Structures are given as structure tokens and as C-alpha cells.
Amino acid sequence: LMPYFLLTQAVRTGNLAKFNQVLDQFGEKFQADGTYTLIIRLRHNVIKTGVRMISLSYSRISLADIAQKLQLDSPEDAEFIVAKAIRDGVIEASINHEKGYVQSKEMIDIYSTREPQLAFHQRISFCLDIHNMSVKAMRFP
Amino acid sequence: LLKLFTTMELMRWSTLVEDYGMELRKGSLESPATDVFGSTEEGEKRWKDLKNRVVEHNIRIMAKYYTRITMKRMAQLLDLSVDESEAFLSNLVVNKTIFAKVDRLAGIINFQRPKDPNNLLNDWSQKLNSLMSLVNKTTHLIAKEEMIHNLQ
Amino acid sequence: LREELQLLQEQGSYVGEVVRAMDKKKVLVKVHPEGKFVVDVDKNIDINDV
Amino acid sequence: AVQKVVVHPLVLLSVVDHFNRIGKVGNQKRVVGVLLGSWQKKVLDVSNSFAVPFDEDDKDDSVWFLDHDYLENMYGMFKKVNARERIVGWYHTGPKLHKNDIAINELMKRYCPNSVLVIIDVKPKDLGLPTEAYISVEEVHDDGTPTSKTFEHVTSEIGAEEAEEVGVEHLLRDIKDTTVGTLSQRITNQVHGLKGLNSKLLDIRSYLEKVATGKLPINHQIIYQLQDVFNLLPDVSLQEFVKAFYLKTNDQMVVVYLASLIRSVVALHNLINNKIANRDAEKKEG
Amino acid sequence: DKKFHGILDQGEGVLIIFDEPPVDKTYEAALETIQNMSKVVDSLYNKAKKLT
Amino acid sequence: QAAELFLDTVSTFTSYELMDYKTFVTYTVYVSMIALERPDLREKVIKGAEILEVLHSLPAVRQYLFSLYECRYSVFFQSLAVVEQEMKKDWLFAPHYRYYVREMRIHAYSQLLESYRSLTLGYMAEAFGVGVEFIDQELSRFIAAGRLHCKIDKVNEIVETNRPDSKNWQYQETIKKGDLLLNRVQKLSRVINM
Amino acid sequence: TRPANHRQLTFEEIAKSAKITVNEVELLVMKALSVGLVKGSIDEVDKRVHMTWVQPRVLDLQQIKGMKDRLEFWCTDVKSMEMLVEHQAHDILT
Amino acid sequence: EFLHAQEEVKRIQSIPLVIGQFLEAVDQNTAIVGSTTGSNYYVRILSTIDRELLKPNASVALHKHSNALVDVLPPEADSSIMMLTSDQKPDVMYADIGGMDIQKQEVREAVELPLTHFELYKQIGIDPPRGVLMYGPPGCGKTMLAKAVAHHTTAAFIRVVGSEFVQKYLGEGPRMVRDVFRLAKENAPAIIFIDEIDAIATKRFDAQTGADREVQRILLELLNQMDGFDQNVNVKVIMATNRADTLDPALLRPGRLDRKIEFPLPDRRQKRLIFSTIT
Amino acid sequence: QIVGEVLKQLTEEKFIVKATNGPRYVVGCRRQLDKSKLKPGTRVALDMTTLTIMRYLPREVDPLVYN
Amino acid sequence: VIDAFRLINANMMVLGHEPRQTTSNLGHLNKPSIQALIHGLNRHYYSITINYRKNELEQKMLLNLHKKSWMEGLTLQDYSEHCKHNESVVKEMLELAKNYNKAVEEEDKMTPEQLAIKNVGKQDPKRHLEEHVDVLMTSNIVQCLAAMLDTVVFK
Ligand SMILES: Nc1ncnc2c1ncn2[C@@H]1O[C@H](COP(=O)(O)OP(=O)(O)O)[C@@H](O)[C@H]1O
């Protein structure tokens, strides 16, 4: 996990050469585990992950600023990346071809308080399967 | 008195000084009237007292009628400018006579207390029960009138 | 428990300080409101059980 | 003149039994007697009943007879045994009311100034109504309407007599008309509440349809005055739900966290205790 | 020091004063119940009885 | 925990154990500064008469403590750097990158931007030291870290905070704990039936 | 006619209804509140008047079809939702 | 059906209760209670209520006609009034008193136990005092020390009032002593202050006249409660008397109450000090 | 009605009323009356049989000597 | 209590006593009170069996009409007292939290039933059982469903 720790640090930072070097050093175990194709996929999706994190960080971030932050050096590439993030739906960052506007959040609506209970009311389903298991497993003799 | 006591009329003192202001110039005896407003210094002081008095009266009657009223209309109704109208509004609120909240940058006012959801749903349920009682009473009334009308 | 409540409607039991255990299944007892109440013996407890 | 009347669960069955016992030979379908009780705080209550044999003829509804001496002796005995009891009204069966009611009221009001009429449905149990109350008002039908009889229904609600709970519980002891079994009982409550709402509102819709057809006389002068407000009362605006999006949804989600989860956790504790016990028993039996 | 109920919107050069509803302490009380009714029990009990 | 059991000003010796009573007090001040920001801390530590006396004994210590209490960032940041330098010269330097100055300024920035909605970066920079770019990068780094509940409008250079209501934030806390305890009960469902 | 179906009594709607000017709207709605026609809130940013009536009158019994239709709409909605919750509740009620 | 039956049998009425004090839970499904009119009888204890509020000698609730254990009333001070929580209230703080000391050093000694120091009572090996009788006249107030101290170190303060206690509620006297002792035990910062002992409560030289045996039995139960305290907690008990001569030896003997303090007359120098302080 | 004193109000529903001659009971209050009219330590009237508060009454003391 | 008996002459006791005749019906649920036993009545001849004329046309009338709740199941009552009721519920279940805590650290390794019998506490797992939590949940869901049913009726 120490090289995995450095991989996490590289994912957060957005740099390339350092983690490429450490992969060339100790990537054979990654190949043995069978994730090296995925390893390169992370190596080139580090920019996507950094874009998600910086979009969560900022409200209206400049495309030039995000390109400089994640080593894109290209306004058009930054625009393409934010387009790809929004079409993937991982983040809510939108595009305004004027300067790169992104909408902010809003106060809580009808379902924003109800989605936790809707996604969590399986508690009674767990209770009923527990009770049925008890019914199955209360043999007296 | 009949005009200026009740029914929340627009007490535009500019109109009143001629509609009901004849006591200043000539009435039946006009002697108490000339003592009050016909005087020069104390008379003008009591004139200003009528002016503000009717300003707060208009503010109060507007409180129970209009929730949000635009600043220009409120100032025109109070026969003053925006700053004077807001100053008198502050003078009322510091006395707690009216429940008023104003956005000064937007210059828009509100007189209704924010309804807590507890009592909001409570009055909703009271409305529901009023409707239920109305259903019961209407049902009995129409059924019995139906009986009387098919007694043929 | 409801039947116990109905029994307690008749006070349930009465506290008695036993003094004299006579041979003929008899105990004088003392009850705080009044005092001595000569009475028989129960079936679960013999004369000597007193 | 009374604001409202409240009927006890004390005289209904007595009236029904009186009907049953005096209808053995009198098949007029018309049981007429007096309901005695008390009126104290604009709330009238009935504590005792009495039936008198009574024969009618359809000819102008003026053929009848009673035993007034016996009825008055009954009232004197009832007042002697219980002074607070007084004749609160007179009752007739046969909810299809005839025209002798005015004469009966005129004759009996010497016992009660605000004479009222009570109809008991011995055989009918339509939805839940045991009886209906009637107040006599002949002071002009309306501002711009001709003369009429116009016996109106003073609002009636079934009261709660004391010390009858023991008897009714012992009597039924089979249905348990209480909130027992809370969840299922409230489900049944919702069910028959919806049933009653649908039936009554369907009756109101039928009354509106029949008024539109005009086959029956139209008492619009109170009908629209009472139903227009009902219809226009704004219980359809949903922006108050917008303002109260967490109307209780916070309580809903805390209950999901703290009742369903708590039940699941306690059931899990019971199951794992039982599993430990069963495993230990299976391992240490021999 | 929570002596006032507002937020200073410097961009608009104003301060938005808001009437804070304090009846929402049920939220925090429920969280405290969750914490002191689950943490103190689940970990301890099902780490003591790891084998079942 | 350290603070809760360490404010007790009952020393076994007048000057021993932790090298002094003054060093004891410096430990107390550091621990409290890590501990909280500014609630009735006035009535918890500031009211301490021995506390005020020992801050009289140590002016610079009194200086940064009163700077944090008064929320005057211009002197606060310099004094906080001095505090970090002092902690470097101390073997109790375990929070070398977490809780020397970053956590304290996380608390300070929370305190500042709360009761604010949109405070400009350029003016908050001079109200909080100098180097508008330095404050901008610090805010970006700390928002990435997770605290400082706000966002940055870079095209206009504004700090638009997002403070949840009492209901909203506590709701968020409850859903987080619901996630943790669903994980717990799923682990316990694994424990059962095996 | 509109049971809060159109609860936005804007100035233009008021002008269509009463062929009255803008300044007279204030006095007209004041007298309406005084008599008992409309008792709702009166705004001026949007000039919206909330709709509550507590002084009913003749509803043109030849036009009782509208209220009959609204009442039967309420009946259909209530019965449909009762049947829907019965469908959801067969697992207990059946 | 069985869930319906279970939720149906859970009615237990319990609206029209009456009060008759519990003696003690001998076992489960058996008990002994004493009603308000006496009539101590053995009863059956239902499983609805148990040890959670079934403290030994606290006043409880009973059914109107069944006298059965239904509920236990938590509060104890207002059962017979006799003062209550004079705590959380500065009436006269401490140094504001005009009597300066008289001694007041034995009284700071008496507050040492409320002023924690129960841990320092051990280790050092000292045995802190328990009973403080002040056999002084109304000079010094004799209650400016108990209205104070109770606020100097936050602690509950009770007037008790001996004259009121001797009354028809002599059978309930033991019970009220138990209740007030329980109120004190509930709050380790508490001090009992009893007044007007000398003339009415257990005079030892004039023979028993009628209800004097009731007073002696009440004092016996007070001794029983103070012995059952046995330094279990840090609450304190102080009587205030004008003359301790008529007092019973049982309270007067060491091992129950030790510290005798006399609060003398204004002491002309101290009197001038009092005048300055009040004025 | 029997005469007693409000020994303890307990709560809004149940109250402690002590008869002048011994027993105190946990009773209800009269519907028309309110707690502000009942108050603690005030003379009241309990129902003879059902044992519930029926009316509250003022009291008086008299020295009746050399008046 | 409605107990009916008969007074007897002196001859019934000198003949074969217990005038209760030869059948196995009046021995069903025949529990005379102690005072009745010590008195002659309810002991002279027998105790009479009671029965209630629960005839239909009468009993159906009573059950249908007297105990009447027919459109009263439509009450909404979302938060009339229920916000503070939920506050109190949270406080009660926090007490339950402390109780179930106490139980889980009691949890002794000596057949915990042995510990529990002598250290009953009437806690959430023992006496404040899941039934009370179910009552709270039923109240909440009943108010929820009434509110939501009327919300969908509101069209
Ligand atoms: N500063 C003070 N110093 C001494 N006594 C005071 C002071 N202030 C008030 N007092 C008096 O002390 C009195 C207490 O008297 P009291 O309690 O009746 O005496 P005893 O306790 O002997 O019965 C009060 O009546 C009050 O007037």
C-alpha cells in the first residue's frame, strides 16, 4: 500500500510523471494482480478525478484555471473535459461558452429529505428476515 | 368621525384638509377648531400631529390588508418620500405595534409571520375537520330535505 | 395480575405480627389499624409452621 | 332555541325494545312516546324513554290517540325517583315524517317549551345513525319565501354516559370496539372513514344532480350558502407543502432510523442470542 | 456569539437577517440517541461474541 | 480529551513534571486552541484568573490567545506562525502537518465566513494578512481538504459560502450516521447466518 | 367558479374583471375585504390576491352543473385513491 | 389475534389513584404498604412498575379501591411542603453577613464536606463531622449561616420547621422524614436545617403530655434516618436551637451529632459591625 | 362534595388532593375549572364517590378572642 | 357483579344439603365470595347463572349505533401536539438508549439470565419492549398516511 498511497497522492494532485515512474518501478505486482490495464486507466483518468474534486470545491471556476490546475494547458481541452464530466453525470458542473459558468446548490426540496428514508426503510426487511431465521432456528430438542 | 374612525379608509390628509378640514376655516362655531389648528405655533404643532397620526393610521390599516406593498406606492400613500416612510415604519416597529420585515436594498416589506410547519399542518388539519363537519351537516340537511320532498 | 388487582380491591392481604400460635391451628396476630385478630391457619403452613 | 343536543348511549336500545314490545299488536309502524332527560348548558341529553301505542290514518294525518294520564303518571314517578330528569322531547319512529307531528308538538310542549322531535330507526342501521333530532321552527321560512313548517335538525352527537362502559364491555366482549391492535385497528378506521366519506359525498353529488334535474323542490337558499365556501376553501394549493417540504418528513426519516432500525437491531439481538444458545446446546448436549 | 441571526452578504453590501427556527432540536436529540444507542452496543457486543 | 482532563490547575508540584507551571500553561493554551474556537470559551478559560495571570507573565502567548479571541487575523496569522515555530522547538510536535496552524485557521475561517455570505477574496486577504493569491490558494486547499463550507466564484473572485441551516446540517449529520450504522448492521447481518 | 384553481388575481385579471384603473384596485379590494368578498392576502410586487370567500350568494342554479361536476371530480379522486391504497394494502386487508 | 389480545389487555386503568406509602418490596409479587390512614397491609406488586422507582421508603400511589401498587410519586419535598429547594438562589451570599464570624470557622468546617473534601477526609485519616447543633438565641440570625453556605457552595437548603412538623401528621411524620432524607440524598449538595426544636420538639424534663409520645416516636424515626445515612453521601444536617438542654441525648450524643456552636448576643463591637453592614 | 387541600398539583392531568383528615388521592380536575383557578395549597372540593375535583373554595382563620 | 340466590327453609339443610341439583352446569365458574359463603345467602340454596339477552335486532343495533366512529377515522393531526410529542419520544428513547447501553455492558458471561433475574432493570430489551417503539412508529406512520392520503385527495 505504500506505492498505493503514492498513487492516491498522485490521484489527488493531478501529476503524471511521478506515478508513471513509480509504476515503472513497482508495477509488476499490479500486473500479477491483473489491474495494470486499470492502472493506466487511472493514470489517464486522474484528470477526471481531479476535475470532480475541484468542481465540488469551486462554484464558478474558470476553464483556464482548471486547465492550469490539472496540467491541461488548453482552454479547449478544459472545455471538453468539463463537457465529458457533465455528460457522465458525476458532477453538476455545466458549460457557458462565455466563461465557464457552473450552477450552485439549492435548499432542500420535497424528496431531498425523503431519499434517506426511501433508501433506508429496508430496516424492517432486515428485521423480518431475522425473525424468519429465528423461526427456522428455534428447534426445541 | 364616521369617516376617520373605522373601515380602514385611505386617510390622505391632503384630501382631508378640504374634505373634512372646513372646521379650520368656518363651521358651526369653529372655536375649538381654531384653538387646536387655527393657532400659529401650537396650531402648526397640532397640524403636524394630525399629519403623523394619520400616517401611522394608514400604516396600521395597510398592515391588516396588504402583505407586500411597493415602496413608491407606500410612500405616496403616506404623502412622504422613501426615507421618511421607512423612518416612520421603523418608529412603529420599535414600538412593536406592527410585525414588519423590510428588504431595504430591494425596498420591499412583509407583514406575515413565517408560518412554522407544525401549526401550518395544524391549520390544514383544522380546515380538513371543518370540511368533514360541513360534509356531515350537509349530508343530514340534504337527506332530510330529500325525505320532505319525496313525501308525495 | 388483573385477578390480583381484584383481590387487592379487598385489600389483598393484611399485615399481621404473629404472637401466639395455638395448637388448634390458631394465631392471635396483631394488625396495625386494630390489633389482635384471632384466626385459623392456612393450608400451606402447618400449626408448627407458624 | 337550544344550541345543540347530545344523545346518550342510554336511551337508544330502550326505545328499540319499546318499539319491539309494543309492535306485537300495533303494526302501525308508528311508535310515539316521550324522551326524558336534562338540558343544562345549551347541551340537551336524554336519560329515559317511554312508548305509547299510537294509531295513524293517512287522511290529513289527524287520526290518533294516546294515554296521557298514564304518561303523566310515568313522568311524575320518574321525577320522584330522580328529580333532575325532565321531558326533553317527544319521539316518533317512521323517519318518513307525516303531518300529525305539529299537533303532537302543540299538545306536548306544555311539558317542554322548546319541544323537539326524535326519530329512532329500530330496523334501519344505514351507516351508523341510531336516531335523529328535530327542532321546531315556524318563524318564517326565509327572507323572501312563503310560509312553511320547516322542522330543522339540531346537531346531535352520541354522548358518553358514565358507568355504562362496564356493561357494554361485558355485553359485547366479542368485537372489542377499542383501539386494540393499534396498526390494524387504525387501518380499519381509515377504511370505514373512507367508506363514510365516499358514501356521504356521493349522496351530496346525487342531491346536486337531482337539484339540477329539478324533480324535487330546491332548498338552495341554505345549500349554496353552506357548500360554496366548502368548495372554494383553498385546500388545493400545494405551495404550502412547498414551504413545508419537511412538513414532518424529518420525523419520517428519524422514525425510519429509530423505529425500523431499532426493531431490526432488537430482533437481531434476539436471533443472535438464540443462535448462540442453540450452538452451545448442540455442542454440549453430549 | 450567536446573539444575532443573520449572514453578512458583502458582495451585495448587505446583511440578510433570517429568523432561525429553533424547534428543530429534535434533529440533534435524535442524532444523540442514534450515537449513544448504537455505538455503545453494536461494536462491544458483536466483538465480544465474534464467534456464533 | 486532553483539554477536558487537562484544564485542572492542580499541580502536584509548584514547578516540576512538565518542566514548569509556565510550560504546563503553554500546553494548556495549545490544547485549548486546537480544541475549540470561540463559544463561551470566555467563561471557560478566559475567566480563569490564573489563566489571565500566566498570560500576563507571557505577553506573546497572551498576544496570540487574545488575537484569536478578538478574531483579528492581521496579527493572528503572524502570531500563529510564531506558535508553529515554537511547537517545532518542542518534542510535542506530532501534528506536524495536520494541527499546528491548518486546523486552527480552519476554525478561524469557519468563524469568519460564517455570519458572512459573499466576502470578497481581495478584502478578506488584507483583513487576514497579505497576498490575495496566498489566501486564495489556502482557501482552495482547505476546501479540497473538506472544511470551510463555501465555494469560490473565480470568474468574479467571490467567496460564496454554503452554511446549512440548523435543520439542513443536522439532517446531513443524521444521514451520515445512518450510512455508518447501515454499514454496521450489514456487518452484523454478516455475523448472523454463518 | 374557480376553487383556488386560478388563485392569482393579478392586476390585468382584475382589469379584465372590473374594467377599473390601477389605483382604484386598492380601494376596491379594501372594500371587498371589509364586506367579506375576498379575505386573502393582497400583494403589490406581483399584485396577487388570495382567494377566500365567506359571504356566499346565489350561484345561478341553472349553472349548478359546474359545482356538480367539481363535486363528482372530488368523488372520483377520493374513490380512486381509496382503491389505490386498497391495492397497496391487500397484503394486510386480504 | 394474539397481538390484538396483548395490546387489549394492556389497559390497567390507573387514572383515579390514591396515595399510601410503600414500606418495602419484600419479594416480587408480594409487598407491604402503609396507607395514609395507617392500616398497614400486605399487597401484591404488579410487574408494570418495579425498582426503577420502587425506592424503599418513598411515598407511592395506590388504586382508589384496590390500594394496589400502581405508581410511585417522584417528588418528596412538596408532599408536606415544609420548605423546598432553596438552592440556585442568592438570598444572602456569605461575606455580606453582618455577624462576621461569631465563629463561622466551625461552619466552614461543616461546609468542608459539601465543599467536596470527602476524598481529603480519607487519605489524611480524618473523620469529618456530621451533626452541627447551634444552641444560640435568634442572635446572628442562626439562619444567615444556612441561607448562606448553601449558596457559598451550591447546595440545597430546607427549613424543615419543627413547630409545623409536630401536628396530626405524626403517623406520616416518619414518612416525611424519609422523604426529606431522600430529597437530601438525591442531591449530595444539600443541608437540612431544623428550627424551633427547644420548646416543642422532644423536651426532656417535662413529662409526656398526650401527643408527646408521638413527637418522641417522630424523633426516633429521625434518629433512625440519620443513622441510616451513616455518611453514605456528602449531604449535611444542622439543627438550630435556642436551648439544647431539653434536647434528647440520642441526637445530642456523639456519633450522631457532635459540633455544638453557640451564637451569642450582638457583641457590642460586632453589633456596631452589624449595624454598618445592614445600613 | 368532600373538602380537601391541593397537596400537590403533580401535572396538568392528575393532581394530589389531601382530605383534611388523612387520605390524599391522585384525582382529576373539574372540566370547567383550570389549573390557574386550582393552584397549589388551595382548598378544593372532591367528588364524594368518584373522587375528582369539583370546586375550589376560599378558606379563613379566626382568632375569635378579644376581637 | 350481579349475584342471585334463594333463601331456604330449615328443611333443605336437614335433607340432602347443597340444593344444587344433579347437573354439571351451575358448577361452571361458580365462585361465591367469602362474605357470601359466611352468610346464608349464596350458601342456602345455590348461586344462579347469569345470561345477557344479546339477541340480534338488539345487539347488532347496539354495536352498530352506540359505539359510533364512522367518519372520525379521517383525522389528520400531523403536528397538533406531535412536534413536542416527537421531542418527548426522542427523550424517552434516549433513556432507552442508556438502558440498552447498561444492558450491553452488563451482558455477563455467566448465563446472562442469571444476572438478569437478580438485576432486573425494566429496560428497553426487557420491559420497555419493542411494543412501545412500535406504538411510536404506528403513531408516526398513521399521521404520515393520513396527511399523504389527504394530500393526494387535494386535487
Ligand atoms: N447580615 C445579617 N446578620 C445577622 N442577622 C441578619 C442579617 N440580615 C438579616 N438578619 C436577621 O436574622 C434573622 C434570622 O432570625 P431567625 O431565623 O428567626 O432566628 P432563629 O434561626 O434563631 O429562629 C432574620 O429575621 C433577619 O432579620
CSV table of N, CA, C and O and ligand atoms in Angstrom, one decimal, chain H residues 92 96-99 136-144 147 159 193 195-196 240 242 274 277-278, ligand 1:
chain,number,residue,atom,x,y,z
H,92,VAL,N,-28.8,35.7,50.7
H,92,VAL,CA,-27.7,36.3,51.4
H,92,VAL,C,-26.4,35.4,51.1
H,92,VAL,O,-26.4,34.3,51.6
H,96,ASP,N,-21.5,38.9,53.0
H,96,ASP,CA,-22.4,40.0,53.1
H,96,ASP,C,-23.1,40.0,54.5
H,96,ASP,O,-23.7,40.9,54.9
H,97,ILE,N,-22.9,38.9,55.3
H,97,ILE,CA,-23.5,38.8,56.6
H,97,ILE,C,-22.9,39.8,57.5
H,97,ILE,O,-21.7,40.1,57.4
H,98,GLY,N,-23.7,40.4,58.4
H,98,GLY,CA,-23.2,41.3,59.4
H,98,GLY,C,-22.6,40.7,60.6
H,98,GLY,O,-21.8,41.4,61.3
H,99,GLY,N,-22.9,39.4,60.9
H,99,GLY,CA,-22.4,38.8,62.1
H,99,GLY,C,-20.9,38.4,62.0
H,99,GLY,O,-20.4,37.8,62.9
H,136,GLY,N,-28.0,28.6,70.0
H,136,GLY,CA,-28.0,30.0,70.2
H,136,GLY,C,-29.3,30.7,70.1
H,136,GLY,O,-30.3,30.1,69.5
H,137,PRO,N,-29.5,31.8,70.7
H,137,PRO,CA,-30.7,32.6,70.5
H,137,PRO,C,-30.8,33.2,69.1
H,137,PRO,O,-29.9,33.0,68.3
H,138,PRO,N,-31.9,33.9,68.8
H,138,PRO,CA,-32.0,34.5,67.4
H,138,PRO,C,-30.9,35.4,67.0
H,138,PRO,O,-30.8,35.9,65.9
H,139,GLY,N,-30.0,35.7,68.0
H,139,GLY,CA,-28.8,36.4,67.7
H,139,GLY,C,-28.0,35.8,66.6
H,139,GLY,O,-27.9,34.5,66.5
H,140,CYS,N,-27.4,36.6,65.7
H,140,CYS,CA,-26.6,36.2,64.5
H,140,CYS,C,-27.6,35.7,63.4
H,140,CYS,O,-27.1,35.3,62.3
H,141,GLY,N,-28.9,35.7,63.7
H,141,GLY,CA,-29.8,35.1,62.7
H,141,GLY,C,-30.0,33.7,62.9
H,141,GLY,O,-31.1,33.1,62.7
H,142,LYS,N,-28.9,32.9,63.0
H,142,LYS,CA,-28.9,31.5,63.2
H,142,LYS,C,-29.4,30.8,62.0
H,142,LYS,O,-29.4,29.6,61.9
H,143,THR,N,-29.8,31.6,61.0
H,143,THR,CA,-30.2,31.0,59.7
H,143,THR,C,-29.5,31.8,58.5
H,143,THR,O,-29.6,31.4,57.4
H,144,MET,N,-28.8,32.9,58.8
H,144,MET,CA,-28.0,33.5,57.9
H,144,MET,C,-26.7,32.7,57.5
H,144,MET,O,-26.0,33.0,56.6
H,147,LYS,N,-28.9,29.9,55.0
H,147,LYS,CA,-29.2,30.6,53.8
H,147,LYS,C,-28.0,30.9,53.0
H,147,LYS,O,-27.9,30.7,51.8
H,159,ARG,N,-36.0,24.4,55.2
H,159,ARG,CA,-36.3,25.0,56.5
H,159,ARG,C,-36.9,24.0,57.5
H,159,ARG,O,-36.8,24.2,58.7
H,193,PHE,N,-31.9,21.9,57.6
H,193,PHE,CA,-31.9,22.9,58.7
H,193,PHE,C,-33.2,22.8,59.4
H,193,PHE,O,-34.3,23.1,58.9
H,195,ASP,N,-35.6,23.9,62.7
H,195,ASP,CA,-35.9,25.0,63.6
H,195,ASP,C,-36.8,24.7,64.7
H,195,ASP,O,-37.7,23.8,64.6
H,196,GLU,N,-36.7,25.5,65.8
H,196,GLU,CA,-37.7,25.5,66.9
H,196,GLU,C,-37.8,24.2,67.5
H,196,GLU,O,-38.9,23.7,67.9
H,240,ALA,N,-30.9,24.0,64.6
H,240,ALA,CA,-30.7,25.3,65.2
H,240,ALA,C,-31.7,25.4,66.4
H,240,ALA,O,-32.9,25.2,66.2
H,242,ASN,N,-32.5,27.2,70.4
H,242,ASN,CA,-32.2,28.3,71.4
H,242,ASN,C,-31.6,27.7,72.6
H,242,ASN,O,-30.7,28.3,73.2
H,274,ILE,N,-22.6,44.9,62.7
H,274,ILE,CA,-23.9,44.5,62.1
H,274,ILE,C,-24.6,45.7,61.6
H,274,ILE,O,-25.3,45.7,60.6
H,277,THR,N,-23.1,46.9,58.5
H,277,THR,CA,-23.4,46.0,57.4
H,277,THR,C,-24.8,46.2,56.9
H,277,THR,O,-25.1,46.2,55.7
H,278,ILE,N,-25.8,46.2,57.8
H,278,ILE,CA,-27.2,46.3,57.4
H,278,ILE,C,-27.5,47.7,56.8
H,278,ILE,O,-28.1,47.8,55.7
K,1,LIG,N1,-26.5,40.4,58.0
K,1,LIG,C1,-27.2,39.8,59.0
K,1,LIG,N2,-26.6,39.4,60.1
K,1,LIG,C2,-27.3,38.8,61.1
K,1,LIG,N3,-28.6,38.7,61.0
K,1,LIG,C3,-29.4,39.1,60.0
K,1,LIG,C4,-28.7,39.7,58.9
K,1,LIG,N4,-29.6,40.1,58.0
K,1,LIG,C5,-30.8,39.7,58.5
K,1,LIG,N5,-30.7,39.1,59.7
K,1,LIG,C6,-31.8,38.6,60.5
K,1,LIG,O1,-31.6,37.3,61.0
K,1,LIG,C7,-32.9,36.8,61.3
K,1,LIG,C8,-33.0,35.3,61.4
K,1,LIG,O2,-33.8,35.1,62.5
K,1,LIG,P1,-34.4,33.6,62.9
K,1,LIG,O3,-34.1,32.7,61.7
K,1,LIG,O4,-35.8,33.9,63.3
K,1,LIG,O5,-33.7,33.1,64.2
K,1,LIG,P2,-33.6,31.6,64.6
K,1,LIG,O6,-32.8,31.0,63.5
K,1,LIG,O7,-32.9,31.6,65.9
K,1,LIG,O8,-35.0,31.2,64.6
K,1,LIG,C9,-33.8,37.4,60.2
K,1,LIG,O9,-35.1,37.7,60.8
K,1,LIG,C10,-33.1,38.6,59.7
K,1,LIG,O10,-33.9,39.8,60.0
